[PDB]
Amino acid sequence: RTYLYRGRILNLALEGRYEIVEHKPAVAVIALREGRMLFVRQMRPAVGLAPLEIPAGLIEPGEDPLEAARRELAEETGLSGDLTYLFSYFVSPGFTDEKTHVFLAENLKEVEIEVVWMRPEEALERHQRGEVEFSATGLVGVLYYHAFLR
Amino acid sequence: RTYLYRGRILNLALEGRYEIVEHKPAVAVIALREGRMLFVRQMRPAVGLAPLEIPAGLIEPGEDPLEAARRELAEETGLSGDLTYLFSYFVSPGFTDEKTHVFLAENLKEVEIEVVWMRPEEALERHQRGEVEFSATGLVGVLYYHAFLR
Numbered sequence A, B: 001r002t003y004l005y006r007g008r009i010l011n012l013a014l015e016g017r018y019e020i021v022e023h024k025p026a027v028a029v030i031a032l033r034e035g036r037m038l039f040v041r042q043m044r045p046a047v048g049l050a051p052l053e054i055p056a057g058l059i060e061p062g063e064d065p066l067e068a069a070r071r072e073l074a075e076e077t078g079l080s081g082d083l084t085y086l087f088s089y090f091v092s093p094g095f096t097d098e099k100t101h102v103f104l105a106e107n108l109k110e111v112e113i114e115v116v117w118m119r120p121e122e123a124l125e126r127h128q129r130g131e132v133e134f135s136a137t138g139l140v141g142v143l144y145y146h147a148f149l150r
């Protein structure tokens, strides 16, 4: 376990042959209101475009997943709600340890980059047409809706 | 765009303030047979455990997504089938450009690490019980099944 770089949101290490990127865990929030899912978009320099995502962010020190979810929902959309843990996933276990905890948000109330309310069916249609790209969180949100929220 | 490392499956660069990990695009294959989904597990040093995933891999030079999907299905499970493109997603746009192309595989036939045939309902139940972890591809497979394959 030799480190080649220790940055702000990630560290680059090596375990003999495997290249490993240590990354802070994250959260994502699925929220549906009047048939529209709460998507967000922001410039993502790593990909050069703004994919359709859902409120999400890194868990801060001292924070647990639930608290981070509450914070990201409020900071990115100015909303609060009743949160329920759904499931988790490793974004790409072949090279990074980033783990994402997904929550469902209900009974949204306004308490205070781009907020994109859109029907999941439309988000899927646009993607299939090549009009918009998805982040893992965005796709998970869309599939979750089609599977359990209709 | 300054590079700090150029490795085998990834490069670590910087765009002023943003730390960016360039990564080859990948593919994942969703396959259902007699109610069981085709999951695979392998030791993942980056996470220290073996999450439930679906056949997947990096696209090789000269290969397009469809061809890579065919290859990974055959190399990891020894199967071939009729493939259909479903959708794509960026695993974690906040720091990497890894894009995953997801395919559906039907009419599987045997042509030649661990193959785990399991009902998606059971995979979800086990995860909720904390018995197994999911990779993004595994979760996408499970949600896709619940949404469109029942």
Ligand SMILES: [Zn+2]
Residues within 6 Å of the ligand: A056, A057, A058, A072, A075, A076
């Ligand atoms: Zn944030």
Ligand SMILES: [Zn+2]
Residues within 6 Å of the ligand: B056, B057, B058, B072, B075, B076
């Ligand atoms: Zn492979």
